[PDB]
Design an enzyme around this catalytic site. Sequence first.
Site, PDB file in Angstrom:
ATOM      1  N   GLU A  21      10.067   8.305  -3.177  1.00 18.68           N
ATOM      2  CA  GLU A  21       8.735   8.320  -3.779  1.00 18.68           C
ATOM      3  C   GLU A  21       8.869   7.788  -5.200  1.00 18.68           C
ATOM      4  O   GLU A  21       8.053   6.963  -5.677  1.00 18.68           O
ATOM      5  CB  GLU A  21       8.152   9.728  -3.824  1.00 18.68           C
ATOM      6  N   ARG A  48       6.939  18.959   7.032  1.00 21.43           N
ATOM      7  CA  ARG A  48       6.249  20.025   7.763  1.00 21.43           C
ATOM      8  C   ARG A  48       7.130  20.991   8.547  1.00 21.43           C
ATOM      9  O   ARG A  48       6.622  21.922   9.157  1.00 21.43           O
ATOM     10  CB  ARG A  48       5.173  19.442   8.695  1.00 21.43           C
ATOM     11  N   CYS A 100       2.376  13.877   6.309  1.00 28.76           N
ATOM     12  CA  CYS A 100       3.431  14.651   5.621  1.00 28.76           C
ATOM     13  C   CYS A 100       4.727  14.810   6.402  1.00 28.76           C
ATOM     14  O   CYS A 100       4.716  15.254   7.554  1.00 28.76           O
ATOM     15  CB  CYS A 100       2.936  16.053   5.249  1.00 28.76           C
ATOM     16  N   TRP A 104       8.041  19.480  -2.757  1.00 32.47           N
ATOM     17  CA  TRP A 104       8.994  18.882  -3.672  1.00 32.47           C
ATOM     18  C   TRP A 104       9.216  17.433  -3.324  1.00 32.47           C
ATOM     19  O   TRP A 104       8.718  16.959  -2.318  1.00 32.47           O
ATOM     20  CB  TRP A 104      10.319  19.627  -3.660  1.00 32.47           C
TER      21      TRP A 104
HETATM   22  C1  MH0 Z   1       0.296  22.227   2.275  1.00 32.12           C
HETATM   23  C2  MH0 Z   1       0.188  20.982   1.699  1.00 32.12           C
HETATM   24  C3  MH0 Z   1       1.537  20.228   1.712  1.00 32.12           C
HETATM   25  C4  MH0 Z   1       2.718  20.699   1.344  1.00 32.12           C
HETATM   26  C5  MH0 Z   1       3.037  22.107   0.827  1.00 32.12           C
HETATM   27  C6  MH0 Z   1       3.685  19.668   1.513  1.00 32.12           C
HETATM   28  C7  MH0 Z   1       5.019  19.778   1.235  1.00 32.12           C
HETATM   29  C8  MH0 Z   1       5.911  18.741   1.236  1.00 32.12           C
HETATM   30  N1  MH0 Z   1       5.624  17.420   1.439  1.00 32.12           N
HETATM   31 FE1  MH0 Z   1       3.801  16.661   1.974  1.00 32.12          FE
HETATM   32  N2  MH0 Z   1       3.050  18.557   2.001  1.00 32.12           N
HETATM   33  C9  MH0 Z   1       1.724  18.865   2.127  1.00 32.12           C
HETATM   34  C10 MH0 Z   1       0.765  18.004   2.593  1.00 32.12           C
HETATM   35  C11 MH0 Z   1       0.791  16.640   2.439  1.00 32.12           C
HETATM   36  C12 MH0 Z   1      -0.342  15.774   2.548  1.00 32.12           C
HETATM   37  C13 MH0 Z   1      -1.783  16.170   2.866  1.00 32.12           C
HETATM   38  C14 MH0 Z   1       0.211  14.392   2.277  1.00 32.12           C
HETATM   39  C15 MH0 Z   1      -0.578  13.094   2.255  1.00 32.12           C
HETATM   40  C16 MH0 Z   1      -1.536  13.205   1.109  1.00 32.12           C
HETATM   41  C17 MH0 Z   1      -1.915  11.825   0.747  1.00 32.12           C
HETATM   42  O1  MH0 Z   1      -2.698  11.192   1.472  1.00 32.12           O
HETATM   43  O2  MH0 Z   1      -1.423  11.355  -0.280  1.00 32.12           O
HETATM   44  C18 MH0 Z   1       1.609  14.545   2.036  1.00 32.12           C
HETATM   45  N3  MH0 Z   1       1.918  15.883   2.155  1.00 32.12           N
HETATM   46  C19 MH0 Z   1       2.473  13.525   1.737  1.00 32.12           C
HETATM   47  C20 MH0 Z   1       3.826  13.620   1.558  1.00 32.12           C
HETATM   48  C21 MH0 Z   1       4.738  12.567   1.183  1.00 32.12           C
HETATM   49  C22 MH0 Z   1       4.425  11.101   0.889  1.00 32.12           C
HETATM   50  C23 MH0 Z   1       3.484  10.991  -0.290  1.00 32.12           C
HETATM   51  C24 MH0 Z   1       3.235   9.575  -0.669  1.00 32.12           C
HETATM   52  O3  MH0 Z   1       4.029   8.709  -0.302  1.00 32.12           O
HETATM   53  O4  MH0 Z   1       2.241   9.311  -1.352  1.00 32.12           O
HETATM   54  C25 MH0 Z   1       5.945  13.080   1.133  1.00 32.12           C
HETATM   55  C26 MH0 Z   1       7.217  12.309   0.787  1.00 32.12           C
HETATM   56  C27 MH0 Z   1       5.871  14.469   1.457  1.00 32.12           C
HETATM   57  N4  MH0 Z   1       4.558  14.770   1.723  1.00 32.12           N
HETATM   58  C28 MH0 Z   1       6.907  15.356   1.510  1.00 32.12           C
HETATM   59  C29 MH0 Z   1       6.790  16.712   1.366  1.00 32.12           C
HETATM   60  C30 MH0 Z   1       7.847  17.648   1.128  1.00 32.12           C
HETATM   61  C31 MH0 Z   1       9.332  17.303   0.979  1.00 32.12           C
HETATM   62  C32 MH0 Z   1       7.326  18.856   1.054  1.00 32.12           C
HETATM   63  C33 MH0 Z   1       8.086  20.159   0.798  1.00 32.12           C
HETATM   64  C34 MH0 Z   1       8.738  20.537   1.935  1.00 32.12           C
END
Ligand code: MH0
Lengths: 405, 405
Positions: free
Chosen positions: B282, B110, B107, B277
């Site tokens: 994506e 974070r 992610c 968000w």
């Molecule tokens: C508490 C849970 C959680 C939150 C809230 C969260 C919030 C956010 N995220 Fe993000 N993120 C979280 C946990 C993950 C995981 C566990 C993964 C990978 C999951 C997977 O294997 O498909 C992930 N996020 C994956 C992503 C991805 C890539 C996904 C993909 O390409 O398939 C992006 C771009 C991303 N995030 C951005 C963001 C953004 C921006 C925010 C808001 C600030």
Amino acid sequence: QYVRIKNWGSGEILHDTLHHKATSSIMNPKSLTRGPRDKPTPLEELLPHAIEFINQYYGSFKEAKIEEHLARLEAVTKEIETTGTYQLTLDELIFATKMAWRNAPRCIGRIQWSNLQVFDARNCSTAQEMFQHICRHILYATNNGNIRSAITVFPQRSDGKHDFRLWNSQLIRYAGYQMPTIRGDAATLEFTQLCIDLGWKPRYGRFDVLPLVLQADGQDPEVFEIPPDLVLEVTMEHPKYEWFQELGLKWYALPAVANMLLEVGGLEFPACPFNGWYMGTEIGVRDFCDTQRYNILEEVGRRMGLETHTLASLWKDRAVTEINVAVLHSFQKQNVTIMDHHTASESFMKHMQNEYRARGGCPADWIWLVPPVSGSITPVFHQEMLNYVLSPFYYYQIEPWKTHI
Amino acid sequence: QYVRIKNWGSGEILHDTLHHKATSSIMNPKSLTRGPRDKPTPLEELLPHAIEFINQYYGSFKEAKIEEHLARLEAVTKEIETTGTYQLTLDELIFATKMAWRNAPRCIGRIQWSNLQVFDARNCSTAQEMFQHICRHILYATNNGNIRSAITVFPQRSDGKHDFRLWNSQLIRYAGYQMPTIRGDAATLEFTQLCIDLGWKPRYGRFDVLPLVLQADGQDPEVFEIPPDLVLEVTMEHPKYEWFQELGLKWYALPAVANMLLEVGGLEFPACPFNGWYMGTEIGVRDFCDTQRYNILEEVGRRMGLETHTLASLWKDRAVTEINVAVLHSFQKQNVTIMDHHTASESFMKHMQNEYRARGGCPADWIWLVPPVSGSITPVFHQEMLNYVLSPFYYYQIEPWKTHI
Ligand code: MH0
Ligand code: MH0
Ligand SMILES: C[C@H](O)[C@H](O)[C@H]1CNc2nc(N)[nH]c(=O)c2N1
Ligand SMILES: C[C@H](O)[C@H](O)[C@H]1CNc2nc(N)[nH]c(=O)c2N1
């Protein structure tokens, strides 16, 4: 046994068996470095390494050569008992170099692996003889801009205190100088200092070709200037942006890496510079756009009149693309072999498909095989890969100036 | 001890100590999947897992709470002896969800880890109560396009035969249908079939929002349609290419992943959908340009009048960039939270720098944190990363339809 790997684009599945023959995001992990010795290679290590290689070699033909296979086994052994090492037949070396290349998990052009020219310089003895061999190399490979893949193999490490070693990172490489700013290739700042410390005359330019710094039979390093008639270059023009030439940019046509070690059959050749040809993004994206090298991106940004002060405008995405367009366009106009990254990527995928049927695997480092722009647009992004070190192999080495004696 | 990691852009060095607290290019490796049970979690495994968590928690404040720390230790133990498990205090859960997020190596957002809203639905009992909780979720997060990070935590796995589970991959997700071609999101072909097999009415469109398929207390799955008033969408306009609207594209505003498991303190919550968000690429690069999904790239290519039949023209590099421009532009025009990938990348780098001083490390999967276009232009490309599974954690799970009973 085996490992299942998925290509998420085509949905196709592949089974890897070749990884069983392996050995024991970081750029230089120790597992990929082969360092110095101070005593020869112990005979019990060496012998089954040699026997295994000799079997790989004689195991490659369609018609077995069991007599000479068996003969070469004994011959190689007798040589090792009597001499403490052995020497490869010229065909063995050729075979080793192409195999090691075939086994380079960070290389994208490996569909070309059986198309390599080998220069046996295993009888070199002095720096000046290296420098002549390197010059023959640069000239053969460059071929007036129709680049040809070649390697010059120098004498194998023996005891470890008589190592032949190019101190350069690549054969052609621009100098970088600290200034009264930084001018030229900032990546070669420390190495440029070293050349100056050894008497080389700095000319303080943006594209000053560095000198070969050569070390033969363990000797101290001698400094040689490359005859400019040998160094071919491409000046950068954009085919619509007339102002691109005013940036005054060029790059060398020969990507020839100088400092890697060939491991084969228990042997080590710490000097075996090789070359392929360029893939546009190396120059377009890395050399020109890495902040740590040349770093033109903001300038091409400003001259496109883009909003270079707001990141959400994606001006970086527009600039870099045109720079890539400049490089590919300039190489084609001036008849220098080059390949764009889309094409290379499809080429590698074809290779992998060929490598899996042929020998049940292909070692591959995703982090390297995916271009530094437009990742998921290329098919390599979507292909799962296993990365493993086979033999023969091209290893990294420790920077010789940190260990010269 | 520790591990040295280099950022090759700034030259900066970082020492990782946090990896010591770890546990035991492939998308779904087993090491990242947490599967089903059929018997409760053995007490000897569970107890030190719980004790360790309770210490992490009480070890997070500036002012220690040694009395309640000690009290919570005993209380938790007594509860485990008498009941065979335990329940987290609401503050514990909140803390667990943000921590697990903090520990999501794939992610990029974070830097936002301590900015999450938690919905305790651990007292849910039936599918219809799930569906109401999910609806509250979708509505809170969406907030009229000012997206807010939220998670709804459902009842923890107990014996393993009473698992609460969303069968969807994301909360909002377009349907994909095989046709008399493929229409809609081809990625959800198999799942769309499943919805149809359970009585859902296919409307055969390119952007038909799928139904929630819910399974509560181990029960069989029930099918619910999402109230369209809750599903917010962005229609795609390009701010210079008038013809972009004629492609007739849109995407949903809420990226809410449904099918991951929260491991914490020896517990498992196999149902805990969360959302952040969108980051433009994506939708721009993956959803719209992956050949396996929607695959518009050749069409936007043709409408730009580019030479879509010669790869060396880099027309793919020009098309995709404009599509990214479409998406970012359409989200801003219609007031929906979004972040471009350049900005996100700088944000993550700031985070990593904060995470290393604060706790000597940050788990990170380079292969995921680097955007699918313009890799080395973002700073994350140049930063070496270590990838490790800590606790708490969000694991993947096995597709429930392959194991439903
Ligand atoms: C508490 C849970 C959680 C939150 C809230 C969260 C919030 C956010 N995220 Fe993000 N993120 C979280 C946990 C993950 C995981 C566990 C993964 C990978 C999951 C997977 O294997 O498909 C992930 N996020 C994956 C992503 C991805 C890539 C996904 C993909 O390409 O398939 C992006 C771009 C991303 N995030 C951005 C963001 C953004 C921006 C925010 C808001 C600030
Ligand atoms: C037999 C040796 C060899 C030959 C010949 C060779 C021939 C070619 N190559 Fe390529 N290639 C070889 C072995 C490597 C290695 C060992 C590496 C990684 C070295 C390193 O760590 O920097 C590599 N190639 C790396 C690369 C890289 C990336 C380099 C970087 O980003 O720093 C590219 C683009 C590449 N190749 C392409 C090609 C092409 C095109 C050809 C010609 C078809
Ligand atoms: C830190 C990261 O491994 C480093 O920047 C890598 C990424 N992948 C690469 N890929 C190629 N082809 N060449 C490189 O130099 C790098 N550098
Ligand atoms: C095969 C490869 O791991 C796969 O295509 C990965 C690459 N990196 C990724 N990175 C992100 N953010 N999302 C993804 O789906 C993927 N897919």
